[PDB]
Amino acid sequence: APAWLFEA
Amino acid sequence: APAWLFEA
Amino acid sequence: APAWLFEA
Amino acid sequence: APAWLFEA
Amino acid sequence: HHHHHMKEIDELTIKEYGVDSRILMERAGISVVLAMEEELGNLSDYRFLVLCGGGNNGGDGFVVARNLLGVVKDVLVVFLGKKKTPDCEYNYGLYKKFGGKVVEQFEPSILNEFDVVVDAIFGTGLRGEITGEYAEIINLVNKSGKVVVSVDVPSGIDSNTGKVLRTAVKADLTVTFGVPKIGHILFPGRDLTGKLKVANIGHPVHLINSINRYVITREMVRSLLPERPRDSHKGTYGKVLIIAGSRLYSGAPVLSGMGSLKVGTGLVKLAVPFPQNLIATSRFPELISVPIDTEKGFFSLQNLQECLELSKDVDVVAIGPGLGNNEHVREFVNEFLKTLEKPAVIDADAINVLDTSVLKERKSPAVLTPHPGEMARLVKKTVGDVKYNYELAEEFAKENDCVLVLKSATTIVTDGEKTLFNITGNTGLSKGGSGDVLTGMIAGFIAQGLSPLEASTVSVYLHGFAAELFEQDERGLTASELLRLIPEAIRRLK
Amino acid sequence: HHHHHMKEIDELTIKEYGVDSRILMERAGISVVLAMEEELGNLSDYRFLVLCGGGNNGGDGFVVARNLLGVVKDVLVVFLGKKKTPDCEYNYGLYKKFGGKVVEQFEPSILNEFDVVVDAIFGTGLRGEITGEYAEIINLVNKSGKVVVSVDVPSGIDSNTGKVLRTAVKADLTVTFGVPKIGHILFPGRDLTGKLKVANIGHPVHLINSINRYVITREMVRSLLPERPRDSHKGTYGKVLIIAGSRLYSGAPVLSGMGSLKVGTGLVKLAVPFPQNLIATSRFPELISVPIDTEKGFFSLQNLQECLELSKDVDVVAIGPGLGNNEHVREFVNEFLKTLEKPAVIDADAINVLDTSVLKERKSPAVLTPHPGEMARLVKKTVGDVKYNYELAEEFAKENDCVLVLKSATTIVTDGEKTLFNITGNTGLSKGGSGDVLTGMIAGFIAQGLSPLEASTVSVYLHGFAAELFEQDERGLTASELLRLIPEAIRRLK
Amino acid sequence: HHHHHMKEIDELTIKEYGVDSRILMERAGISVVLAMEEELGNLSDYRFLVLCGGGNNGGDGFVVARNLLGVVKDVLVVFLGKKKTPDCEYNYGLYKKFGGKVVEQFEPSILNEFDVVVDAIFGTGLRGEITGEYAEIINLVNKSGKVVVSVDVPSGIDSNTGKVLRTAVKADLTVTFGVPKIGHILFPGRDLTGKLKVANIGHPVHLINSINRYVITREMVRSLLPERPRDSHKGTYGKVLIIAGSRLYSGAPVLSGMGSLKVGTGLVKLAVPFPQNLIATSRFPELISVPIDTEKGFFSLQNLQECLELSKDVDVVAIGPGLGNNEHVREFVNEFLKTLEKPAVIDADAINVLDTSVLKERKSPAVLTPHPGEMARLVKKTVGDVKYNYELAEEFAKENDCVLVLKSATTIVTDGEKTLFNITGNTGLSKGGSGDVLTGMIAGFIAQGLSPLEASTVSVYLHGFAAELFEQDERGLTASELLRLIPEAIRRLK
Ligand SMILES: [K+]
Ligand SMILES: [K+]
Ligand SMILES: [K+]
């Protein structure tokens, strides 16, 4: 999952 | 189609 | 479920 | 389609 | 005895059959509630604004309002009249006794706090233009974006003609009682009706069936489609002659001919001025396209004898598409029809040059298929005076002993005694060549044994239904594609 | 003001709200027609025999018959009365005016020419045993194999009790008006009702809601299920002590305990005579099963102090499953309950030895969960006198300040003021161990904060619903499998 | 006030709205990162080589590089400039302070140790041909086979024209800021851009909307498509005359006519020299194809009066496809257009013989539809000077009071004030007959009520979109199949 901006 | 009440 | 006329 | 950041 | 109106039907059901008027009014309102539920789903989360006039339409509205009390999120009646009919007063009284809130002042912002508007202002009792408070309110509802449900007829539509009386409600759903009204069927009314449901409210069924003007239905057309006995030959299915075309209009004969063949006719012959006749077999080699030697590219009296000879061996003659309209064509058309002792389907340029005296003297039947411009020129009136004018169409058919098929988005089919309305089709049919196809279909069904009226009824329905089956945007439909779709329309009808 | 009966509701709607009785009767009959259509599909191919009595049930039948005229294959009314109420006379008159055929003689072979029987003979006005012509006709309909539709109540069922008055119609579909009647809910009536539809015929909604006896519904149980706040610990969800078992009945404590845990209780402790206490943790090690040293394998007064001590640290105490019923148990049960200042759920052998004086003197609440044999022994009556006897249950609960849960296929839950009927379940629950589970569920819901009445309501519904979720034949259901199904029943309820 | 360039928009956003230039630069770089993630997925396993120039494009590159630090496998910046703008210096400083590695020497083998190249060398600040170190590096990147992501514009493309300034980066993905640049839209730039994403970096929305040159979008064309009111007739949807064809070019009239009909026009008439007129109705009999008697197979002044007569009863006239180009055609075309008081769509051979003085004196509007060879001959310039020359097109349209539709892979549509660029289509349209279809579409939309500019906008979009819907290889597309696809393109647009 692309996670440059957000960590869930 | 049951049509006692309504004709479309 | 539409129930103006009937409750089951 | 959400497009706040990008127009394709 | 036939009965033009629901007014006579209601009166008989009350005064002769003995059904209390209040029972009819209750049945009307509960049918609106049920219809709303079919269309919106569960009603319990919605807020309803019911707009009631002082007549029995408003009375129906009070029934609706009262039946929603305690079951939906909110109900409010705005009573817009100055007095109440007795049944309206009775149901107003019930609504209040059950806890219902009525206001007599309409505040523009009131639309904000509701989800559904129930339009019970005017029904069949509308008389004259709507103005004043009534008009401002109707204009506010049409700008509101809310769900609109009209009781019997959208307020502002003349239920006998479909005309708008200054302004009218645009409904998402119209629930009408007993039978559709003419104003649901003809435009602009048809457009403002939105989805139409016809509710049985308890009239005796034979009174409902006593109505003499009908919408053409799928079931009616299914029962009229001719039988195809297995042991048959082409002659079983009739022979059509099409007299059509000119040096100017070479395509019309082709569309008319294939229109006959696609509905199951056994043999189709065209008579077309040479060399334009060769256009037809170049596209569809199953057609017979007889070359007619003309002086200047148009039918004239010099072709009278040859056309009458070709007519001897057919069942029906279609005439008019692409003939042109000059003096030589007029003499030919009128002398031919005067002499032809076969049913005739008369279209386009044959209508433009027609001497209606000739129809009066013909022993054989005729179907005429004008659009309103052609009808207007035929009776010497304005387009606006003949358009959707079913009474004038009836008078014309009766006086001239023909079937008249007045084409428009809703097509009127009449022999002067029975009138049928067709609502199948779409705007892809508003394009050159569409009418030529229909002419062929009618002649084809006549050749197969249907009466002129039956042939016309089946043909207008199937022609519109074929248009609806087009797979891409309707504005791209052309007559050649409509032809391809006819056999699918037939299959689907069965 | 609450209203025991539809009779009072009908009267108020007519006399105080002002709805004409004929409007109610029309709404009743059209609701039967609509219900038939939902159940049979299109009515047009069916032949209907409508059996009408001389009261308003027969009047409703005339409405039905008249509304089918001209729309179905055939309609015939057999009028079985000697006279007609005014609304029945009115609708009989309408039916004939509309062209309907009535006969007054019932011929056994008449059943042959019809597909559907509409049973409009007796409704709520039935008084006394059915005999004579009426009975022969009902017996002929029940042997016929036709589709049977009953108007309001199958004829022959006492709408207040559910008893059969000599003979009664067995219906495939019953359409009732306003609210279910007690005779649809209790057996044998429940069985003869077949599929029940409850129709809104126009009574004010607050009068309909004024009824004080209710069927327990999914929506009602959903709204009562306790919240599970995320920031919680076992104490949030309560603690239950179960005092149960004996050397003879070692399994009961286990089923009761797991019944508490499966409904979400935080801590469950059993007190069970040693070594039978070890049975419980051998099957379910999440239970605490405290060993009680007994003289001969049964609780006695020598265990009084230890049980009261264990009760101090719990929210609710369940007592009775598998205790046995001898004199030493009776002294223990009664002294314990007299002293226990916690809510108690009293079942099985604790009911069999109960001194009802003790309930009268308790400050804390109690739920009792008898089957009819236990109830019978408790009030010193016959099983036949207490079975489905909701008035006696109400009187008992009110006089003894408890909640009474009278178990049967339909279970009655009452505190003397409010009475609820449960219709979930199946015959897999007619098997040892089923009741033990329910006892645990009730104590568990009380421990989680529901009132004794609310706990009982939710528990009887979910216990029956869990039984219905069993995947194989119901007769194979055992209590251990019922336990496994409880959490699925909960999930499905949400 | 409209604003030709992002340069003016950036300046206003900084100097008048007060957004720090560094905030715009941060928003630009993070938008590149997000775009890369949408296109590559998770970035964490990739190694990035970021090539930065000394201007603000390189500054954007430093933002990108810094934002990848610690999150991807490796990051390296090659700084290729001799000095740095202030924002570039600021972000270079941040990148190093965050631990980032910069080198100033480009080693050919460096491409080997990276997966993605971020091209931040030159953006809109490119001036003149690229040579030297810069060129060798761009040539090395284009031979590398790595994934290439360009910041704002691929380096080497002139953002105002789309021309390559000696050499340019071929990108897989270009992320541009605020609005597309002309160099993304016109070729060769369009080809080198690869996938284009347009990022919002914080400019006020009304400044972004102040741009006067637009890409034609699906949403724009959807809002311009004319309404199809249900109550309509063929005249509602307009009438077109097409004056086309010759003994040499018999097919063109057919394609143009069907182009009008497929977009929903009500009536289409062709005027075509006899006997070539019969070709049209042989293929599509819904067309009217009027025979024009000519001396040698071409329109001449002897046909002037008949064409003007036929024009009286139509809404729009299309002229030119297949007319031929000799002196007699030139006299006819120019005298006809000088006299015709209807909108005209002027194509092909009518453009080749056109006296532009005639356009200046016409009161009625005109659309001209040249390809670049035709445009070149029309203004007496070389093909290379007019191709993609939108300023010249604007000047021509303004000076001659027409709409100019300059056809190429990207088609330019302009009235001199507003210029629109179309990017739909494929190489199947590079084939005889394609243009003839478009001419018909434009005339058809004008006849339906769209302005010449609106008609041209909708038609070029739908003509290209129809080509893209062809199901097999684009090189096999022919005009006849393009016609079949038009109604699907319309459906899909809705
Ligand atoms: K209305
Ligand atoms: K009954
Ligand atoms: K760049």
Side-chain angles (χ1 to χ4, degrees), chain G residues 44-176:
Chain G
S44 75
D45 303 298
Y46 292 96
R47 302 166 296 175
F48 295 79
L49 186 65
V50 179
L51 306 180
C52 293
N56 289 341
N57 197 241
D60 294 342
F62 282 111
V63 172
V64 174
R66 184 198 92 237
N67 282 291
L68 301 175
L69 291 174
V71 159
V72 301
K73 191 177 277 158
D74 195 32
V75 186
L76 175 68
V77 169
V78 184
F79 175 68
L80 302 169
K82 326 318 308 173
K83 60 205 192 51
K84 297 177 184 83
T85 63
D87 295 337
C88 181
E89 178 70 45
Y90 177 68
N91 288 114
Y92 160 76
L94 291 180
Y95 175 70
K96 294 186 60 54
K97 255 319 193 179
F98 274 56
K101 182 186 204 321
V102 183
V103 291
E104 288 194 338
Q105 212 69 44
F106 188 93
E107 234 288 315
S109 62
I110 201 55
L111 290 173
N112 294 351
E113 286 122 359
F114 295 91
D115 303 304
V116 181
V117 180
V118 176
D119 162 36
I121 303 172
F122 307 124
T124 56
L126 176 67
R127 293 286 177 280
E129 305 281 278
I130 298 181
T131 48
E133 162 212 54
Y134 295 109
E136 281 163 24
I137 298 190
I138 292 174
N139 295 340
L140 287 155
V141 170
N142 294 342
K143 286 178 185 85
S144 75
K146 299 315 171 147
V147 173
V148 181
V149 179
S150 292
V151 177
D152 207 19
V153 185
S155 298
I157 290 305
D158 182 334
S159 73
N160 293 325
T161 67
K163 291 186 158 173
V164 164
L165 299 199
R166 198 161 170 280
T167 186
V169 170
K170 187 153 194 308
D172 303 288
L173 171 67
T174 295
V175 188
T176 197

Side-chain angles (χ1 to χ4, degrees), chain E residues 45-112:
Chain E
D45 303 298
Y46 292 96
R47 302 166 296 175
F48 295 79
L49 186 65
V50 179
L51 306 180
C52 293
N56 289 341
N57 197 241
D60 294 342
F62 282 111
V63 172
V64 174
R66 184 198 92 237
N67 282 291
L68 301 175
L69 291 174
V71 159
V72 301
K73 191 177 277 158
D74 195 32
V75 186
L76 175 68
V77 169
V78 184
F79 175 68
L80 302 169
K82 326 318 308 173
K83 60 205 192 51
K84 297 177 184 83
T85 63
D87 295 337
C88 181
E89 178 70 45
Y90 177 68
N91 288 114
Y92 160 76
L94 291 180
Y95 175 70
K96 294 186 60 54
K97 255 319 193 179
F98 274 56
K101 182 186 204 321
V102 183
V103 291
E104 288 194 338
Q105 212 69 44
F106 188 93
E107 234 288 315
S109 62
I110 201 55
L111 290 173
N112 294 351

